[PDB]
Amino acid sequence: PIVQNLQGQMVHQCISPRTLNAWVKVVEEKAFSPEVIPMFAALSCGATPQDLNTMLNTVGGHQAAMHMLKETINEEAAEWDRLHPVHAGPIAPGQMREPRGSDIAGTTSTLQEQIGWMTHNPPIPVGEIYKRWIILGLNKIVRMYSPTSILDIRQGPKEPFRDYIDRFYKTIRAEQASQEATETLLVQNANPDCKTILKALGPGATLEEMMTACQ
Amino acid sequence: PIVQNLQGQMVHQCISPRTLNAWVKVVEEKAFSPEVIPMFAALSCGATPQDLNTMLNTVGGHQAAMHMLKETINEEAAEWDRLHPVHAGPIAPGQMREPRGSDIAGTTSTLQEQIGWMTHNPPIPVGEIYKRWIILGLNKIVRMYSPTSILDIRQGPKEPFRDYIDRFYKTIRAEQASQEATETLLVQNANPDCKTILKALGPGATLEEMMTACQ
Amino acid sequence: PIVQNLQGQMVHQCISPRTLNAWVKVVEEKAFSPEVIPMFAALSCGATPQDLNTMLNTVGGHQAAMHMLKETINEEAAEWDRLHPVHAGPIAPGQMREPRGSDIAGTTSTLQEQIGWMTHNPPIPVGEIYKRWIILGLNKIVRMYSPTSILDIRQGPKEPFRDYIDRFYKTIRAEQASQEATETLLVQNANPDCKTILKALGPGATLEEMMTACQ
Amino acid sequence: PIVQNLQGQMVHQCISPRTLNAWVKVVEEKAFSPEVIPMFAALSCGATPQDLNTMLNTVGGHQAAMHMLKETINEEAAEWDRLHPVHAGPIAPGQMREPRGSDIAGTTSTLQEQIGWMTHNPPIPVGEIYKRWIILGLNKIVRMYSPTSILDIRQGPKEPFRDYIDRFYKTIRAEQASQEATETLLVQNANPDCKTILKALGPGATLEEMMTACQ
Amino acid sequence: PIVQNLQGQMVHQCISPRTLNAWVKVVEEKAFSPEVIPMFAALSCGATPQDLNTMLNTVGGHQAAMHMLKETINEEAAEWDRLHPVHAGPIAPGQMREPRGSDIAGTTSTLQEQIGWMTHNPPIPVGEIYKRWIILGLNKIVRMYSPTSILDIRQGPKEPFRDYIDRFYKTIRAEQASQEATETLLVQNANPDCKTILKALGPGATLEEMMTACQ
Amino acid sequence: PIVQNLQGQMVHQCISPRTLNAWVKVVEEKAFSPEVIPMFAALSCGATPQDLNTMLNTVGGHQAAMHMLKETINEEAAEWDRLHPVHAGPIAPGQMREPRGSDIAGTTSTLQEQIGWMTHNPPIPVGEIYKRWIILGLNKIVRMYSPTSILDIRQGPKEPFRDYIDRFYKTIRAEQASQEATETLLVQNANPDCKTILKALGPGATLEEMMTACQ
Ligand SMILES: Cc1[nH]c2ccccc2c1CC(=O)N[C@@H](Cc1ccccc1)C(=O)N(C)c1ccccc1
Ligand SMILES: Cc1[nH]c2ccccc2c1CC(=O)N[C@@H](Cc1ccccc1)C(=O)N(C)c1ccccc1
Ligand SMILES: Cc1[nH]c2ccccc2c1CC(=O)N[C@@H](Cc1ccccc1)C(=O)N(C)c1ccccc1
Ligand SMILES: Cc1[nH]c2ccccc2c1CC(=O)N[C@@H](Cc1ccccc1)C(=O)N(C)c1ccccc1
Ligand SMILES: Cc1[nH]c2ccccc2c1CC(=O)N[C@@H](Cc1ccccc1)C(=O)N(C)c1ccccc1
Ligand SMILES: Cc1[nH]c2ccccc2c1CC(=O)N[C@@H](Cc1ccccc1)C(=O)N(C)c1ccccc1
């Protein structure tokens, strides 16, 4: 990544063994549960495009997902080039060239070039731009791997209301990849006894009040 | 987070893998036992609003609780805006804008803006303000998930007094989310034999003296 | 905590995840065995009162003990105020106020105020003063939870002398919370065969010589 | 490795116990699954040739693979010498000598010499050149150890499409050591029921659309 | 401990959680096997007397050993005072006082005083002096807890020579607490068949040659 | 060890708990498998002779090996003294004395003296010289503990060629302690069916080609 040192200058640092292991382990343990995305975002803080590829490449399983991600990345890179045409020809000696999509994704740019862009004034934040494309792709994967429609999250006869709502909002998060009348659906999908109580509370009731009421 | 370096300047640092993992693990192991809150507060030392959202977002379970927390945050943000109206219109070029509720909660502000506020002189401590809203919400969740009324904590016939008092004060802490005649209730809820001894001690007895007496 | 940086200035640093976890784990594994106290003292090196409360608050069990500790802290704070009366009224603008007991215990003081006192010249060491009150309270808890009188530590007929003395001095440590004719009691509580040998050695024998003799 | 310090100078640092252990453990757990290569590349960030040999030498198993790697390294070193002949004879006193293949591979060069080349202006990046030779060799090993032809990855009658595609693209990655009408082969190797659905989608369908269709 | 910072000045640093845990764990796992002593010496690198007491105090078991250690420390402290009499009376204002035995052992000196001595020019190395007394005491404990005389280490009829010599030199190390015609005793204690071979080798044979011969 | 700080000066640093534990654990898990030596070399990067003795002394088992190592060290030290006679008599006040063998091995030199030599200009690299003697001794131990002659590594009738070659080159490494017509022996020791195939390939075949051929 690129970070500021003790002196107060933006410099390249090697990706740490702890960061590398943390990412590999969260994917192994959580697959593409929605909470994997903010972990990725946090673990890749200050990442160069090279670092982002490193993280994605260290993942051993889920190769269908990784292929889908590559497709998303390629789509975002093509769109970048459409919006930002770079002039062809030889580079001005010793000067910074303009990044293409494939340079942002780290396929055609060097670490040195990436550092050059990210530490320029003003910065051309290729790490952040690429991370946005990656997260866009990861959100599609999260939605793909969400196993259940919210329509099928219904409270069991003996299921505690707390456990039901945990399943309900877990499912909403996966189905929408953490992107924000669900309270109405929550009541509709509740079991008969809790549903009666929730109807009596009326509209405008908070989740807190509903939980208290069916507790 | 924002910390002071070796040179003595307040700078942004990436949230560490160790911090991220620690928070995820304490929630996995302790759910919303009262001691989770001071751990959150300590692990989020110097946190930007972005960091606070990262920590909350890395939590995979407990989505009913997280939805309740969002409601609390939205309430505190609306109240902030009522007390602190920001003037609409274009920003003075190159100048710091005033934070709205949604900027404090990190939904409408950038990391750069957050850094700007928190390192300004004087600091506009958006990380600390948001953390206060979050802890307020977490305390409600702790009280919600407290499984037992203090009225139902009673010493068993063969239960050691020490074990009884551990249950008693554990329950008080959960019921009040660690926010401070309970000594009287403690005696009332004691078993017959210990209760007789505690009555003989009289009023003004310390917990230490009571424990000695029923030991 | 407050520490000196590379440059050589006393600055605030966030309490580390490793420190937080270490304290929580030693309490989980050792409860209030005497060796927990020096671990607490070492892990809270340079701690502000806020840090000390953080450490105590992260403990989930042992709430009877924690309530006893609060009583000790309140007693020491009242005594502080009796010995050190602070003048009431408005503070001199921009000047350091005098700490009351509740400020030392971190209930009525801010982190900024705590930093101000601890880094003043000369320092008003509120972290160290509070830690002393806490350790005083923890020592009472260690003595409370010591399960056995030294009178009941007696060598078994087939018990190796080494194992007996380990139990003996372990018990002395707990009963006195590591605060320093026990050699005589050690002999009295020894089994018949070892006792005869130890009597023959006579007075002035070291523990080393006694162990050799009954080995 | 060679890294830049807080002051902003390129200096040698000892390889860390965490780096050493991470590499040894990933080889123990993953052997030569394709994802081992980008982990190697990341863990050897800034590595001197000495560091690269250290990492390779700490591996206890897989000695057939390590012998193959040595052969690749020797081939790349011979080619280097063919392209870059070094003038024989005594060195100019106190001056930098030109690296031969065996100097790049760290068999005939000292750490001091390696540091000299890598921190020269311009740098003669012997660590990076050697790492390229090593990765070239590791890719051959990955392809050697790939256990299955893509021709034999076929969807089972009851196998979920997601699981089939995971096997498919895992195999492509191994067979090509992560070096980029497979969508056509993917359809051909699908089971009858999914194959019919995929034919109806027609050409130009994304993996995402195919997965949706056979989900 | 006292260490030199990045700037190059000798300053106090808090003992680390990793150091504290390492010492506690090595004692738990190895008791007073001889190799515990050099681990103690290494983990207490740069330790103040306060740090040394912290390490010793964090040990929960082995209280007979710890009492023996205290006796050794008290003996060494009395001898220090005999050799180095300190002048009684009031201290020169703002000046360094001379350390007594109890000051070196950290019972009557403050951390500040300890820092003062250890960073003075020339340094009065109270940490190193105390560590010497402690190691002297630990060596006595190692010898006390050595379970077997070298006279009873004899090669079994079917015991491999390598395993026999491991037991032999392990025992010598414990019996002498790692303080350096044992080759003759090694032969005498060997089994008949190996003994015959070793006699044929004659005198002046190395351990290496003996091992080869009975292999 | 001796390392360069942030400022760029060579200073002593305490050996880390992580380094100490890593070495102890690799010996516990791997004994004297050949890969232990490069781990030792890497973990002792920048080590003083004191540090090297610390590492060797923290090893609890394998005392026969450690005694053999001491013999090798004593041999190398005697040879050093033969080649480098030091003038006897009093030292020039405040000046650096010349290291003898026993000073290089850290038996008769202080840490201060060791630091003096290693940071002198030019450096007298006593840490590196001693490490060379130690590795020479460790290589002898690796060869001693190598359990099998390469003559007895033969491919089983049903043993996969890959597994056979792993055993073959593992054995060569141990027998030669990683110090570099074995391809011919590899073929001779192959099973009948693979041997026939390998003969047909002819001379000059790479290991890669042989593996392919018998795969
Ligand atoms: C955790 C979660 N569950 C969801 C369900 C549907 C849609 C989105 C989500 C999210 C992500 C989610 O909304 N996370 C929150 C942070 C958060 C997490 C957990 C509790 C409270 C606040 C967030 O990122 N932002 C910007 C936010 C902050 C305050 C209010 C609203 C949004
Ligand atoms: C741990 C605990 N149990 C409770 C029961 C009811 C209400 C609150 C609580 C708390 C939190 C609790 O009160 N924690 C204490 C710190 C503490 C923790 C444990 C032992 C001693 C001191 C705290 O945060 N503060 C500010 C405090 C400090 C001194 C006296 C009184 C309060
Ligand atoms: C460990 C222990 N057991 C005890 C039994 C009764 C009373 C107190 C204790 C203690 C604490 C205990 O006395 N710890 C010792 C340090 C120590 C620990 C272990 C072995 C040697 C030295 C200590 O803190 N100090 C100041 C000390 C130092 C030297 C001599 C006497 C006291
Ligand atoms: C992970 C993987 N599977 C493959 C199958 C066949 C050939 C190569 C591969 C690779 C390596 C692979 O291609 N990894 C990607 C990074 C990556 C990994 C995972 C998901 C998305 C992006 C990479 O290194 N680069 C340079 C890249 C970046 C964007 C688009 C295309 C390539
Ligand atoms: C490890 C060990 N076994 C012993 C048996 C009897 C007496 C002492 C011991 C020791 C401690 C022991 O002697 N350790 C060695 C270091 C060492 C450890 C292991 C192998 C090689 C060198 C040591 O500390 N020093 C100063 C030393 C160095 C070179 C030669 C002789 C002594
Ligand atoms: C790992 C190994 N197996 C052996 C068998 C017989 C003799 C020696 C060995 C070694 C040590 C071994 O040779 N290790 C290699 C590094 C290495 C390790 C593994 C794969 C590729 C390169 C090494 O240290 N050097 C200097 C080296 C580098 C390039 C070519 C030749 C030698």
mmCIF file of N, CA, C and O in Angstrom, chain C residues 39-65:
data_model
loop_
_atom_site.group_PDB
_atom_site.id
_atom_site.type_symbol
_atom_site.label_atom_id
_atom_site.label_comp_id
_atom_site.label_asym_id
_atom_site.label_seq_id
_atom_site.Cartn_x
_atom_site.Cartn_y
_atom_site.Cartn_z
ATOM 1 N N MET C 39 0.353 -9.046 36.712
ATOM 2 C CA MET C 39 0.046 -8.998 35.286
ATOM 3 C C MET C 39 -0.767 -7.739 34.977
ATOM 4 O O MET C 39 -0.476 -7.038 34.009
ATOM 5 N N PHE C 40 -1.772 -7.453 35.802
ATOM 6 C CA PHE C 40 -2.564 -6.238 35.642
ATOM 7 C C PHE C 40 -1.667 -5.008 35.687
ATOM 8 O O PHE C 40 -1.768 -4.130 34.830
ATOM 9 N N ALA C 41 -0.796 -4.954 36.696
ATOM 10 C CA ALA C 41 0.115 -3.829 36.888
ATOM 11 C C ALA C 41 1.020 -3.616 35.671
ATOM 12 O O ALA C 41 1.243 -2.479 35.244
ATOM 13 N N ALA C 42 1.520 -4.710 35.109
ATOM 14 C CA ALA C 42 2.409 -4.645 33.951
ATOM 15 C C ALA C 42 1.648 -4.278 32.669
ATOM 16 O O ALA C 42 2.088 -3.423 31.899
ATOM 17 N N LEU C 43 0.491 -4.899 32.454
ATOM 18 C CA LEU C 43 -0.313 -4.607 31.261
ATOM 19 C C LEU C 43 -0.863 -3.173 31.245
ATOM 20 O O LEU C 43 -1.135 -2.629 30.176
ATOM 21 N N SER C 44 -1.018 -2.574 32.422
ATOM 22 C CA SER C 44 -1.503 -1.195 32.548
ATOM 23 C C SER C 44 -0.357 -0.180 32.720
ATOM 24 O O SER C 44 -0.565 0.926 33.213
ATOM 25 N N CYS C 45 0.848 -0.555 32.308
ATOM 26 C CA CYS C 45 1.984 0.353 32.332
ATOM 27 C C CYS C 45 1.674 1.616 31.517
ATOM 28 O O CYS C 45 1.252 1.532 30.369
ATOM 29 N N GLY C 46 1.840 2.777 32.145
ATOM 30 C CA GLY C 46 1.535 4.069 31.529
ATOM 31 C C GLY C 46 0.056 4.386 31.333
ATOM 32 O O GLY C 46 -0.282 5.369 30.675
ATOM 33 N N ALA C 47 -0.832 3.581 31.915
ATOM 34 C CA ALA C 47 -2.267 3.735 31.691
ATOM 35 C C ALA C 47 -2.824 5.052 32.232
ATOM 36 O O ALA C 47 -2.471 5.484 33.324
ATOM 37 N N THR C 48 -3.711 5.676 31.458
ATOM 38 C CA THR C 48 -4.541 6.759 31.966
ATOM 39 C C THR C 48 -5.670 6.147 32.795
ATOM 40 O O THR C 48 -5.960 4.951 32.667
ATOM 41 N N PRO C 49 -6.340 6.964 33.626
ATOM 42 C CA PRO C 49 -7.532 6.446 34.303
ATOM 43 C C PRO C 49 -8.579 5.874 33.352
ATOM 44 O O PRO C 49 -9.202 4.865 33.671
ATOM 45 N N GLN C 50 -8.745 6.488 32.183
ATOM 46 C CA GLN C 50 -9.624 5.940 31.153
ATOM 47 C C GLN C 50 -9.202 4.528 30.753
ATOM 48 O O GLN C 50 -10.049 3.655 30.609
ATOM 49 N N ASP C 51 -7.906 4.326 30.532
ATOM 50 C CA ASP C 51 -7.386 3.001 30.191
ATOM 51 C C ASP C 51 -7.637 1.981 31.300
ATOM 52 O O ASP C 51 -7.978 0.838 31.020
ATOM 53 N N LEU C 52 -7.438 2.392 32.548
ATOM 54 C CA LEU C 52 -7.669 1.509 33.686
ATOM 55 C C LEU C 52 -9.132 1.081 33.762
ATOM 56 O O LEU C 52 -9.427 -0.097 33.991
ATOM 57 N N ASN C 53 -10.050 2.023 33.547
ATOM 58 C CA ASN C 53 -11.483 1.677 33.512
ATOM 59 C C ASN C 53 -11.822 0.754 32.352
ATOM 60 O O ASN C 53 -12.604 -0.181 32.507
ATOM 61 N N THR C 54 -11.218 1.013 31.196
ATOM 62 C CA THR C 54 -11.370 0.140 30.039
ATOM 63 C C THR C 54 -11.009 -1.302 30.395
ATOM 64 O O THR C 54 -11.767 -2.231 30.111
ATOM 65 N N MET C 55 -9.857 -1.486 31.026
ATOM 66 C CA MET C 55 -9.393 -2.830 31.375
ATOM 67 C C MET C 55 -10.351 -3.514 32.345
ATOM 68 O O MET C 55 -10.752 -4.666 32.135
ATOM 69 N N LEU C 56 -10.733 -2.798 33.395
ATOM 70 C CA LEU C 56 -11.676 -3.340 34.366
ATOM 71 C C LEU C 56 -13.041 -3.634 33.741
ATOM 72 O O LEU C 56 -13.650 -4.670 34.044
ATOM 73 N N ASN C 57 -13.498 -2.753 32.848
ATOM 74 C CA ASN C 57 -14.799 -2.909 32.191
ATOM 75 C C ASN C 57 -14.885 -4.022 31.150
ATOM 76 O O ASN C 57 -15.979 -4.550 30.910
ATOM 77 N N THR C 58 -13.756 -4.386 30.544
ATOM 78 C CA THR C 58 -13.731 -5.466 29.560
ATOM 79 C C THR C 58 -13.908 -6.845 30.189
ATOM 80 O O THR C 58 -14.153 -7.812 29.464
ATOM 81 N N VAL C 59 -13.790 -6.932 31.517
ATOM 82 C CA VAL C 59 -13.989 -8.184 32.244
ATOM 83 C C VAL C 59 -15.488 -8.504 32.299
ATOM 84 O O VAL C 59 -16.274 -7.715 32.810
ATOM 85 N N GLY C 60 -15.866 -9.672 31.786
ATOM 86 C CA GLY C 60 -17.262 -10.092 31.735
ATOM 87 C C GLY C 60 -17.769 -10.788 32.992
ATOM 88 O O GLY C 60 -18.899 -10.578 33.407
ATOM 89 N N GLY C 61 -16.958 -11.630 33.603
ATOM 90 C CA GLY C 61 -17.432 -12.358 34.794
ATOM 91 C C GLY C 61 -17.138 -11.613 36.078
ATOM 92 O O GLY C 61 -16.885 -10.407 36.073
ATOM 93 N N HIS C 62 -17.177 -12.345 37.183
ATOM 94 C CA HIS C 62 -16.652 -11.871 38.456
ATOM 95 C C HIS C 62 -17.235 -10.536 38.887
ATOM 96 O O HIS C 62 -16.534 -9.698 39.446
ATOM 97 N N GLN C 63 -18.525 -10.344 38.644
ATOM 98 C CA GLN C 63 -19.131 -9.040 38.901
ATOM 99 C C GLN C 63 -19.278 -8.703 40.387
ATOM 100 O O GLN C 63 -19.323 -7.532 40.748
ATOM 101 N N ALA C 64 -19.332 -9.716 41.247
ATOM 102 C CA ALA C 64 -19.278 -9.499 42.695
ATOM 103 C C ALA C 64 -17.939 -8.877 43.077
ATOM 104 O O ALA C 64 -17.887 -7.896 43.816
ATOM 105 N N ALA C 65 -16.859 -9.448 42.554
ATOM 106 C CA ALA C 65 -15.522 -8.898 42.765
ATOM 107 C C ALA C 65 -15.432 -7.466 42.238
ATOM 108 O O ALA C 65 -14.916 -6.577 42.922
#
